[PDB]
Design an enzyme around this catalytic site. Sequence first.
Site, mmCIF file in Angstrom:
data_model
loop_
_atom_site.group_PDB
_atom_site.id
_atom_site.type_symbol
_atom_site.label_atom_id
_atom_site.label_comp_id
_atom_site.label_asym_id
_atom_site.label_seq_id
_atom_site.Cartn_x
_atom_site.Cartn_y
_atom_site.Cartn_z
ATOM 1 N N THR D 1 0.854 -1.224 0.000
ATOM 2 C CA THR D 1 0.000 0.000 0.000
ATOM 3 C C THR D 1 0.873 1.253 0.000
ATOM 4 O O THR D 1 1.643 1.480 0.932
ATOM 5 C CB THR D 1 -0.940 0.044 1.227
ATOM 6 O OG1 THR D 1 -1.652 -1.196 1.339
ATOM 7 C CG2 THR D 1 -1.945 1.198 1.110
ATOM 8 N N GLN D 2 0.741 2.057 -1.051
ATOM 9 C CA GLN D 2 1.478 3.309 -1.183
ATOM 10 C C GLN D 2 0.518 4.474 -1.361
ATOM 11 O O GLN D 2 -0.692 4.292 -1.505
ATOM 12 C CB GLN D 2 2.387 3.276 -2.412
ATOM 13 C CG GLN D 2 3.665 2.462 -2.283
ATOM 14 C CD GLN D 2 4.593 2.656 -3.482
ATOM 15 O OE1 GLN D 2 4.642 3.735 -4.088
ATOM 16 N NE2 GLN D 2 5.332 1.607 -3.833
#
Lengths: 244, 235, 195, 233, 212, 240, 222, 231
Positions: D1-2
């Site tokens: 997750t970015q």
Amino acid sequence: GSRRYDSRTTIFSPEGRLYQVEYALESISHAGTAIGIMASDGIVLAAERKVTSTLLEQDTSTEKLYKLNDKIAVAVAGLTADAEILINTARIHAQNYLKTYNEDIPVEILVRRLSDIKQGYTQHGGLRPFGVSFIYAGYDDRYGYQLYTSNPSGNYTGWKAISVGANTSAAQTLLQMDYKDDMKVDDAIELALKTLSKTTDSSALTYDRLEFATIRKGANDGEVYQKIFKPQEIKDILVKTGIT
Amino acid sequence: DRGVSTFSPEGRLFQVEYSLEAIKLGSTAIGIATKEGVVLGVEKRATSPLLESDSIEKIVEIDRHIGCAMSGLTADARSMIEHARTAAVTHNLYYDEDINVESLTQSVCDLALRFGELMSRPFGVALLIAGHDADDGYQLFHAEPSGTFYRYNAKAIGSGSEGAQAELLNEWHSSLTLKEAELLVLKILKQVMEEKLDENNAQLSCITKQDGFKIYDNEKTAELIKELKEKEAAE
Amino acid sequence: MDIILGIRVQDSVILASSKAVTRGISVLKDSDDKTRQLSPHTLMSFAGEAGDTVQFAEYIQANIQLYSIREDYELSPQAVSSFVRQELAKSIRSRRPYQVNVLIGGYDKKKNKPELYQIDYLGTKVELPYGAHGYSGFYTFSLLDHHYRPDMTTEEGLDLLKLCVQELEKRMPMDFKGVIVKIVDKDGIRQVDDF
Amino acid sequence: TQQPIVTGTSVISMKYDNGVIIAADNLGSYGSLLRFNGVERLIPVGDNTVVGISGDISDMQHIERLLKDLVTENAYDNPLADAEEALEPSYIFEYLATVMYQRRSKMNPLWNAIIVAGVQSNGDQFLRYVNLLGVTYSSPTLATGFGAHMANPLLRKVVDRESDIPKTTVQVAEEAIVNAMRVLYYRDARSSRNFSLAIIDKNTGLTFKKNLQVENMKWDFAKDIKGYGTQKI
Amino acid sequence: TTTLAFRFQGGIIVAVDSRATAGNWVASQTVKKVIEINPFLLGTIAGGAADCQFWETWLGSQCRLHELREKERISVAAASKILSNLVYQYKGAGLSMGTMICGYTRKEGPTIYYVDSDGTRLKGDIFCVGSGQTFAYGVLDSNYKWDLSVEDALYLGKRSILAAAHRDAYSGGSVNLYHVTEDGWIYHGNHDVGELFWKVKEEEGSFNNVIG
Amino acid sequence: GYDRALSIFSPDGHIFQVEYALEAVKRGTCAVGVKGKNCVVLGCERRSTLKLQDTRITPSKVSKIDSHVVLSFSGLNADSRILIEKARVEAQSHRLTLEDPVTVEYLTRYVAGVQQRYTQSGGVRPFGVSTLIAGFDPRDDEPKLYQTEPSGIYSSWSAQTIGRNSKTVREFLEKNYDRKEPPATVEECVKLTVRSLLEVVQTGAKNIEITVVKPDSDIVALSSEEINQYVTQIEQEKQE
Amino acid sequence: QFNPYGDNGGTILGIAGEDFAVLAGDTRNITDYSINSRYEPKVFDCGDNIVMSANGFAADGDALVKRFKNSVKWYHFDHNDKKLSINSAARNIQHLLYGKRFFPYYVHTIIAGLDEDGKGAVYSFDPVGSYEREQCRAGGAAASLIMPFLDNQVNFKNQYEPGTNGKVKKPLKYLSVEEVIKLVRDSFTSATERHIQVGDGLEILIVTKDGVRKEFYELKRD
Amino acid sequence: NNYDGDTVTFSPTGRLFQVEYALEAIKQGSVTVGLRSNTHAVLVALKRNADELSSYQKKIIKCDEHMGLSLAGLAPDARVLSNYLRQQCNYSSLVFNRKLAVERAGHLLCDKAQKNTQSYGGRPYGVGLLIIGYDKSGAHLLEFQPSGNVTELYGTAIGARSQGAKTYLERTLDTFIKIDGNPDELIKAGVEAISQSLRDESLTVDNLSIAIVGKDTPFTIYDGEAVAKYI
Ligand SMILES: *[C@@](C)(CO)[C@](*)(O)[C@H](CC(C)C)NC(=O)[C@H](Cc1ccccc1)NC(=O)[C@H](CC(C)C)NC(=O)[C@H](CCc1ccccc1)NC(=O)CN1CCOCC1
């Protein structure tokens, strides 16, 4: 590679014997004699210290007799360092059983597990076996007073009276002669000391070359007491039986 | 000592060559392939008369369309059979079909050389894998501990193998019936066996497309033994 | 899984356990035995999350039976209950805990005394004269506080138990389809077929 | 997750008769802040491929290093590294497309939209798209971000289908790209006037144009616009 | 789904519908919800289609491996417990399975085992599983007797599915019938509800709620 | 981990470690198994060089694997405990998953499989133990008797003996045991077992152990006096 | 938060004949309200007379097709170049799909070909692997529009014999390749009219014992 | 002598005896021949049988549509190495959409065989391989030896009595290299080459094994009645 230097500790001989186990037993046969005698109202543990020196601190010493819990004790014959490894394991195993079941461990269960550890070193791992033979003396509410022995093979057996270490051949003959089933603790104490006194390689049996212990129901009403004898207490019991 | 996976100066793996000697000591097993089916037969060889011979399981089912006979250190075959059965059932699960006899044999032979310093030594047992599939029909394979497998029209393994193989060389032809093949296995087994052949110390089996793999009863084999003796005395 | 009761009397332990197995808006079964025999003189009833209950009960049963064979000896109810508690005490801090509450009724042959243990899914053990899990306790405890006496017979215990089931059948919202009653005493475990 | 931090906007491209054109502005935005102005978002691989990248710039710089390392690795034990066994646009794309999907499948994506433009060894035009999800597609015109909404419509008026490619010259095609870049400057709030353009031709090879500017803009009509309804002054 | 199976004098009846849904979308009307594990074992499936199909297809492989290893057909108890122990390992992961393992063996006789994805395993004489289980229960329970004939039992099973197929929006398509005896399972045909409903209405005189 | 391949082939096609494990079995005290018409009896030798023993607590030669199956052995005593433990766990594991106790064939097959695994696993030596496994399958009245050995091979026997001087007692059983008509009663089966051990043992005092197994988990161990009665009866009939 | 799935739109259609089978699919690829490509094929020849399409999320669709194509390759290597039967391929695909049960391929898969009796076959799969052989199946965005039309025209559902008082059903029969292609083309032109994600072009793959033939048709580009 | 116990030991003259013993296993193996032109590459292999009742051991294995090899020595080792080549060819296709170069195929085999000759416990591979293929730089022929040494050649042969076929190809070099756009004539040259390694036995229908790859020819194997043309 490293194959070149491997002794192969866990293999069979052509005759079907375990080399290392046999040689470990040969080692134990030179160790100080230890005797266990089981009576109807208690158990005796007697052991001879290995060639004592006069400057050895005798009172604050522990070579032969060790305590596993409040109800069970062991007499050692062989490498002391090896025995202590096994003793701490046995002490831990007893506490695990108490923690799990809220009941003191039955003697045989403790003996079996310790013997199973020794067995493991003879079948796998490629390590040398423990050069140790135990005499287990203990009590539980199932079988009462019990004597066992284990050796480097991991095989254990029950006994009424038994010796390990040096001169067991001579010692077992003398025990077999004078032992009888309706025996008391005080009589068993006398037998243990008389047997060591005759089988000893020393000139004369003295207090400073002995460790002694009893497991009686001599405490107040239906409970077991472990008595590891002090130097002065061994001195007194040695005079009382008429050895010195 | 010396390494397990070591080559000899001649260019062979010592341990593989030694395991082949163990297989020569084993009891005789014979397989014959025909267009009507494949027949598998073995020498039970009970070590004592008190041993209940019906408990000697040297012929074994892998799937409904694949059977197996063994010779040598028969205890080693258990994990080989287990793998074969799993391989056969697993392929049916993945592909909704029967698995090829060759592909099954190859899967078993992949275990063979997975030893060294994986298991500690090669297998001390040879297998005759017989079966049927839609593509190549009735087949007989000889699986060794070397990882090699040959297809055979007929094959004998075990103590009387070289004597039996020479006999199979002469007797086999491409138009053999199933009944003829059954008798031929019994005939050759009786020749190489030490003790006298009967229904208790020898076992027959077959695999056909219709009925699948079947181990024969002692009552059925007994009649084939009686039929065999009568035919030899008849000329 | 809902109603499990236990009553220790003079010479025995009596366990009552509901027969209903419900999922959604359907009673799938009305003859379910929510108990396992751990040893000849030890019985464990259970109630909680679906699947977990039987999986846990049988796992305990297997372990106790293994002990019995190994030592050729029957563990005391106190020892069994302590083993069970420890398993649940481990469980609660696992990735997925056993959501199972149990009653352990047993007869100690060495002491010649019946014993009833109540253990919840957290591993909270208590020895009691009478016990219950779930909403059952909210009715039965006060009822037993009044009517229970320590010197009662097994027959008196069964009448006392009938009194509990009647109250539950009157005031409980769900239909639990009656109970299977079992008695644990010096002669072992037996089931009351007509209740 | 970015979450993407420093970002690059539209990358636009199209096919023409002898090759492909690709373009992208030189901006590195930090949200609404137009932080960096000297950012090159077209990266040549060999003399026959140009990879245009939009989205997160830190992930773009990672991809640069991968492509740079890919050229090095291909040269190892390869006598025909500058000939028959040279890197093709299709090889470079499939590699990136493999990585993009593997990263999305580990829930840790390279937050980008990529267009690999080039010419194959047999003279065929290569133009294919890939993004953070591992989604891939090809078309006569390809564009990312706002480019997809505003450039593609304009570029598709020139090359609407496959048969229009041979009819489109490099002069006409470049004119459409430069026009598209102007429209994006008018209407994309995270765009810049300065941009780079690359032409990969099967005859004349790779032509890389830097420091271009949007010009011939219409702003004069703004003076006549007063208020938002009534107002006359 | 709607599936049932009940035990009676003449063995076991097993009946299922054939519908498959994705929300309100009717995805299929011809799904096979009876898995034929072997000539003596049947398995019903309800819940997640893939979960049920994949794992009961897998169950058949495990049962096959049992009889290869043990030279004997697996018991209904052991078969059901392989499946229940499997789904218990996946407990919490979100498997959706409502299954009934029906079959005959010498030692057990006719036996039915309910197994579901949250680990519940129950032996019993009557079970209905699925979104329309309640509708099947209503007809089945009110007409059930142990002393039903093979002919009457087959019909009651069929009629119970038909009842559920009618009322439950997420059940329908067709009825698949099976009869399990000491000699193994016997298939008793596919019965399209499209024709079966009107056939039952006319002959039986039931379904008076519907416009005839 | 210790990897060394201890069990390996030799030029002549033998695995010496497995064969030397058999020698350990040959050294062990004698054990005998005889199965009758409705029972199986497991006889076991106990060497009499060990006096001052405590027979209450000393590990018994015959071990219960489950309530319906028993296991006796010949060879290394410490090794036998490991097999018995594994077998006991597998017995409970089988009841848990199959909801039915193990067959005597299955339990034997398992124990034999363990023994085999130790003949081609790195770092381990074979078990110096051969076992006699006896009992009755669940809901079955046909007596079962199996034998295993270090190599891993196993088989069923009408009657069998293992351990030291086993070739003598096997010779006795081979002529005295009739296949067509086995020991019809419990007394006949026990007598034949005691007779066979009396060919080897020495004295029939506290040297012979007998354990009788009957259908439906009916296992009982005979006491000294009960065994001594068979010894007294056989010797009187012998003098003829 | 990062969403690993997307919707690339499009729709697919499989119909089986007596000695043939077709697998059709539009060539439009989309994301939200934008067109990505007007010609991006998603029906593939996988070898052994098996055609396959995995409509939905294109990245997962391409991954699956790529893996099945590879599964066919290794089936030949491991089993002596044996032909992978359509039923075997279907079961194999189930294991591919269910293998990612807890992180699924967001696709509706359809394969088509000939069974071992030489008769036309169509199999369809849900995202997690449940499959079923059928004469008829539509999949994807416009499946809800096309499928009931197929029930009516391929399987003759709700159609009775005239003048029989709704007592005798219209008898089932196989359709010719010419009649099937008519139904495919009409299904897609109808779907294009009423679904925004469907259009641009139509690509049909026809499978007979001779091999795999292709046909392409223009669709409305709005 | 004292330095052949394992692969990790060097002899005083700097030799690896276990590697040399693995090389010896190849010489015992049946003969196989490889040769190429500019358009095609051919493998010809003499298969061996246990006896008349047995089948003939398959010598040729396919690695990809454009690449494959023939074996000589331990067949299971050829299965391990060919399987590795299949995966590497397959990795190149899936990741880079690129057919694996025959030269890289050799480099990968060399490096795999090498690791087995420098570590304790493992053993060298006991098989020699002849890899043929057609890639972007035309037709190729490689010779793999389990020492690790891989060599690109116009033609060669390995196995028992391979020196006869290798001498023939050394004489015929100028002729067969120019057999372009003619498969059958290139095979004939290969069949005549392997015939120089025959003693007592001759090439029969179920004995001979041929494989070919080329410009517009995928890697295909010919066995049985399909090779009757070339006898
Ligand atoms: C009655 C008929 C209804 O409950 C039965 O219980 C049947 C059982 C039969 C089929 C064995 N159950 C279903 O039909 C079942 C209901 C259901 C749906 C989802 C979860 C649990 C239960 N339906 C399915 O399993 C369908 C079967 C297909 C349509 C043939 N499959 C789906 O809905 C799939 C997979 C769902 C899923 C489960 C677990 C993890 C991931 C996904 N989903 C889709 O097809 C989504 N789809 C996308 C847009 O098109 C609409 C459908």
